[PDB]
Amino acid sequence: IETVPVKLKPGMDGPKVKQWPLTEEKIKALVEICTEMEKEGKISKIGPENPYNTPVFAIKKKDSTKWRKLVDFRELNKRTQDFWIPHPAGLKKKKSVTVLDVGDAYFSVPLDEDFRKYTAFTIPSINNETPGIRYQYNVLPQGWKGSPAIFQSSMTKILEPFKKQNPDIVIYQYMDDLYVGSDLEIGQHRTKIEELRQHLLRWGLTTPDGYELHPDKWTGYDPSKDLIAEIQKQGQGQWTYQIYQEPSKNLKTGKYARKRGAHTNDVKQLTEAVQKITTESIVIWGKTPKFKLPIQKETWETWWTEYWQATWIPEWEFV
Numbered sequence: 001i002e003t004v005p006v007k008l009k010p011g012m013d014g015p016k017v018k019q020w021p022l023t024e025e026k027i028k029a030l031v032e033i034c035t036e037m038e039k040e041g042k043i044s045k046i047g048p049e050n051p052y053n054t055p056v057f058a059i060k061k062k063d064s065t066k067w068r069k070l071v072d073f074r075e076l077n078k079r080t081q082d083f084w085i086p087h088p089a090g091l092k093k094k095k096s097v098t099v100l101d102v103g104d105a106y107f108s109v110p111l112d113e114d115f116r117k118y119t120a121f122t123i124p125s126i127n128n129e130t131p132g133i134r135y136q137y138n139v140l141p142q143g144w145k146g147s148p149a150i151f152q153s154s155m156t157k158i159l160e161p162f163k164k165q166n167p168d169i170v171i172y173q174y175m176d177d178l179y180v181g182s183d184l185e186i187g188q189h190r191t192k193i194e195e196l197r198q199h200l201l202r203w204g205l206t207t208p209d210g211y212e213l214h215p216d217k218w219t220g221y222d223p224s225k226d227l228i229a230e231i232q233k234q235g236q237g238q239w240t241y242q243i244y245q246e247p248s249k250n251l252k253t254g255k256y257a258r259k260r261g262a263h264t265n266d267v268k269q270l271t272e273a274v275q276k277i278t279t280e281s282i283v284i285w286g287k288t289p290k291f292k293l294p295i296q297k298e299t300w301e302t303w304w305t306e307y308w309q310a311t312w313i314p315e316w317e318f319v
Contacts, residue, residue, distance in 0.1 A: 003112040004150050007081045014052040014118040015075040019132065020301075022124055026058040029067035030123045033058075034135055042107050043135040046120055050136065056121040061101075061208060062309045071121055072313055073143045083149040087223075087286035088172050094181030096189045097213040097283065100197070102155075103176035103311060105205045106140035106147045109154065119144070142176055142311060158203050162196055171196075174282045175312050181215075215283050221251060227289035229277050233266065239273050243281060243289055252284070270295060271307040278314055291316040 008014065022030075037043045055072045091097060111119070116136050123133040140147040148155070152173075159171060169192065172179040180196060182189050197207050222245055231241045237258035244250045256276055258269040270293060278288050293300060297318040 001110060003110050006112045006115045006146055006150075008079050008118070009081055012079045015054050015079065016052055017054055017072075017075055019053060019055050019122040019124055020057075022057055022305075024126050026067075027124055027126050029058045030056060030069060031133065033067065033069050034123060034133070038135065040107075042139050043137050044116075046134045046136050048131075048134075050117050050120045050134070052118050052120045053134075054119065054121045056123065057305050059305070059308050059310075061311075062211065064208065066208070068311065069142075070308070070311060070313075071119075071141060071143050073119075073141070073145070074313055074315065076118055077145040080145050083146070085152070085173075088170050091170050091172050091179060091181050092215045092218070092284050094170060095183040095214060095216050096186055097170075097179055097181035097215055098189070098193050098210045099213065099279075100178040100180065100193075100200075100210045101176060101208045101311065102173075102178050102200070102205055103142040104207075105155070105158070105200075105203075106142060106151055106176075108204065109140045109151055111137055111139055111141070115146075143313075148173060148175055158200065158205070162199050166192065172286075174286060177311075179283065183216075213279070213283065215280075218280065220249070221245070221285060223285070223287070227251075227281055227285060227287050228292065229274075229281070229289040230292045231270065231273055231277075231294055233294055237264070237269065239269065241273065241277055243277070252280075254280075266295065267300065267303045268307040270300075271304055271309075274314065274316075275308075275310050278310070278312075288312065288314045290314065293318055295319070 038045060054076060057070055058067045059070050060067055116138060119137040119141055120134060125132055140150055155173060168182060170181045180193060200207060225245045227243055227245060229241055229243050231239055234240055239256040241254055242250045243252040256273045258264055259272055274291055281287060281289050291314055293316050295318060300318060
């Protein structure tokens with residue numbers, strides 16, 4: 001076949017980020033996953049000769065029993081070159097929008113051999129029987145900024161048939177998810193989703209069941225600048241947030257009520273709020289905000305991975 005040359009931004013080296021400790025449950029799940037990815041060729045074992053590292057952990061999506069590997073490529077993404085498909089203002093106007101995970105599609109495209117070293121990561125060892133189990137990718141990895149950009153031409157022709165027969169439908173890709181929206185009746189909308197998934201399945205693409213959304217009831221953007229989200233605790237499970245680019249010019253405000261449940265706390269509820277706000281920012285503007293979270297760094301960093309349910313990770317800072 002053939003790959004796409006890729007580069008880090010000028011003057012920048014690959015990531016050297018320590019692996020953080022994990023629960024035995026997550027370690028066991030990463031070992032099962034990575035064992036299989038290795039046999040399939042998607043990743044290769046490596047040793048300490050590779051000086052780069054990126055943290056890994058494991059998560060379960062909302063209403064799902066399947067562990068999913070999540071590599072926190074945020075540092076590699078900052079350092080990866082920019083790549084040179086505008087945002088659909090119509091998406092936020094649709095009666096219904098379904099979110100499909102298509103991250104499995106990347107694993108069919110090889111990664112430039114000279115870039116692979118930068119994607120190394122380390123599964124910690126249970127009971128310290130080894131110093132760790134290390135791998136690097138041979139294919140486009142989920143969560144890397146480069147993967148949807150390189151795959152895009154492939155994605156366009158995967159979707160050309162379906163779009164040709166359904167122009168009343170909007171399909172927007174952000175990172176590793178498709179956003180599929182229509183004003184159709186929900187029954188009509190839900191079966192068009194199946195139709196799309198059948199088609200993607202014919203291409204090998206399997207898709208975890210998607211989250212549904214209805215933005216038409218959600219109630220001066222400069223796309224060259226970052227979005228910022230601030231969150232405040234209100235008490236009794238309630239939260240407020242503002243999204244803005246210049247401090248006094250708010251573009252959106254809202255409030256978030258914590259998920260019902262016997263087990264809850266501020267960290268879990270914050271991860272819920274971040275995920276709901278990020279999802280809305282993507283549908284409205286196509287960008288994930290940088291979050292200002294009302295919580296101590298150490299507390300967040302100790303616990304947030306116990307509650308994360310998304311395949312992406314935003315930037316955040318603390319107080």
